[PDB]
Structure formats: C-alpha cells, structure tokens
C-alpha cells in the first residue's frame, strides 16, 4: 500500500518495487553482509530512541519492529550461506524472498510507529489551543482580554506553522486539502473571536441588554473553532 509521507516513500518505495518476483544465483555474502551491518545499526538507533523518548506508545510498539527486521535479516544471512552451497536450492530461494519481505515490513512498521510519535506531539499543540479556547468565557474586563490575546495570538501562530509543515509531507491529497482548509477556517476565525469578546466585555462594563446576543456569538465562534481543531486532529491520524 501507498506510503503516506513523502519521506517514508523515498526510503521504502525503491525496494518495495524490487520485492516483486529458474537457475543460477550469484554469491550474495558480500551484499547480504552489508544489509546485516545496516540492520544492526537500525536496531542500535531503535533501542536509543526507546530509552530516550517520553512516549509510552513508542516504547511498546518500536521494539517488536526492530525484532521483526532482526529475525528477517537472519533469514537473509542464512539464505546466502545455503545458496553458496547450491545456487539452485529452492529452499534458499524462499528464505531470501521472505527474508527481504520481512525486512521491508519491519522497517515500514518501525517508521509507521515513529511517525505516530511525531503526530502526537502535533496533536498536543492542537489540544493546547483547544484548552485555551474554553477559557474565553471567563474574560470580563478589558485588560483581561489583552492578557488573553497576548497568549493565544502567538499560540495560534505556532499551530499554523506546524500544521502547514506537516501537510506538505503527506502523499495523500485529499488529506492535505482537509488540513489546509481547517487551519484556514481557524485562522480567519481568530479576529472574529477577539472582536466577539471585545463586544462582550464592552456590553458588560456598560450594561446594555444585548449581552445575551454577544455571549452567544462568542460561544458560537468558540464552538466553530473547536469543531475544526478536532477535525484537524482526526485527519492528522490517516
């Protein structure tokens, strides 16, 4: 299946194609030995990323992936041995096939697992903005609105830049378009919310009945912004 993320694709596509399969099989010990060295290094980096992370999901999912490419590389190292003895060995032929297949899967798994880690980081940036929207209803003075704008202003900015950088990476197009729209809606809606609050606060500090009205446009805007951010979160996970 299609590797999502322009990065996973450049790593795995060339060899995913090749893995789409007679007589003589040349002597593979030199090349298979370079696979074996590289997979040792991958497992190395894996173990490191595990002890170094604070993500619980990454800790339980990444190891089973090193192991899978590790045992798959074993099958490749052994298939070479065998093919050297009998170039026409049908056994050996299959270990090589499954060996390579295992290496493709595990590596892919490992990266799918690492990609999920990065998505959670992003998800948490969103949840931060979602939290801070729920605090909108408590701003009642005009100087407390200034505090608010000061924190949420830059916060929206960080979210925008980082969703933007994320979408450019996906290799699915509808997913890319869903994100971009949703980040646009939320960005357009920020000055609307401030204006909404600015109206509430004024209508409060002056007492003018149209405060029933102001409070519900404020709320409608908070809701529309929240509905969208949850949509960003959903899409992030495909």
């Amino acid at each position: 299946p299609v590797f999502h993320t322009r990065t996973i694709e450049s790593i795995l596509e060339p060899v995913a194609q090749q893995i789409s399969h007679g007589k003589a099989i040349p002597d593979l010990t030199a090349p298979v030995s370079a696979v074996q060295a590289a997979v040792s290094n991958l497992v190395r980096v894996g173990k490191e990323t595990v002890q170094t992370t604070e993500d619980q999901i990454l800790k339980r999912d990444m190891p089973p992936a090193f192991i899978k490419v590790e045992n798959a590389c074993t099958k490749l190292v052994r298939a070479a041995q065998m093919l050297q003895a009998d170039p026409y060995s049908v056994p050996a032929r299959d270990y090589l096939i499954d060996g390579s297949r295992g290496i493709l899967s595990g590596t892919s798994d490992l990266l799918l697992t690492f990609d999920e880690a990065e998505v959670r980081k992003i998800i948490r940036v969103c949840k931060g903005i979602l939290e801070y929207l729920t605090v909108a209803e408590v701003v009642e003075t005009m100087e407390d609105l200034v505090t608010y704008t000061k924190n949420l202003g830059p916060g929206m900015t960080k979210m925008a830049k980082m969703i933007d950088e994320r979408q450019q990476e996906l290799t699915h197009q509808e997913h890319r378009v869903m994100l971009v729209n949703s980040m646009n809606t939320v960005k357009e809606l920020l000055p609307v919310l401030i204006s909404a609050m600015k109206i509430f606060v004024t209508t409060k500090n002056t007492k003018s009945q149209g405060i029933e009205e102001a409070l519900k446009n404020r709320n409608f805007t908070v809701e529309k912004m929240s509905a969208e951010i949850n949509e960003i979160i959903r899409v992030l996970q495909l």
Partner: peptide
Amino acid sequence: XXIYXXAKXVXXXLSKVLXXI
C-alpha cells in the same frame, strides 16, 4: 532523526542484494 538515515541505509543495502538477481 537518525532513524530515517539508518532505515535508508538498510533499504539501500537490501536493494543491492536484490539488484544481483
């Protein structure tokens, strides 16, 4: 991350085995 470069070094290595059939 270092993860990507290591994975690529296994993807490349493996290609060289297969390009020998």
